[PDB]
């Protein structure tokens, strides 16, 4: 039931993500140089980086926050497709998987140990 754990754990599954192929296109934000359309298109631009320095910045106040914006750079991914058979957006797809299967953990736990704060 501890409630400060998920941050640790966000850190660690950031880790991963960042040893992965598929995470190279969102690491960083999307080069407005290369795809001078992207702000015509996406609203609210959102990459790794920034998510891993909101996380050591002490501004996220749970995993649900933090998994609000990695859901963006999947998001924006799929609104910034050309098409459904893209490289990019085919790497956008397998990333969220793994991320959604390791967080749904990180989410349980830190609910579960909010309730039994107010039990
Ligand atoms: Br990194 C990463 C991203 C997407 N899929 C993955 N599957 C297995 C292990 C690491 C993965
Ligand atoms: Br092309 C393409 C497809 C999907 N998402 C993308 N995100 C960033 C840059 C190019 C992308």
Known sequence: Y???????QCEELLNL????????????????????????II???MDFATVRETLEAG??????????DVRLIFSNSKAYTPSKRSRIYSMSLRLSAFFEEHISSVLSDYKSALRFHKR
């Not at 995470?23 to 702000?39: A, G, N």
């Not at 501004?59 to 609000?68: A, D, G, I």
């Open 2 to 8: 501890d409630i400060q754990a998920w941050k640790k």
């Open 17 to 40: 993500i960042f040893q992965c192929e598929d995470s190279e296109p969102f690491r960083q934000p999307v080069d407005l140089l290369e795809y001078p359309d992207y702000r015509d």
């Open 59 to 68: 501004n996220y106040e749970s995993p649900m926050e933090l998994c609000k």
């Open 43 to 45: 609203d609210t631009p």
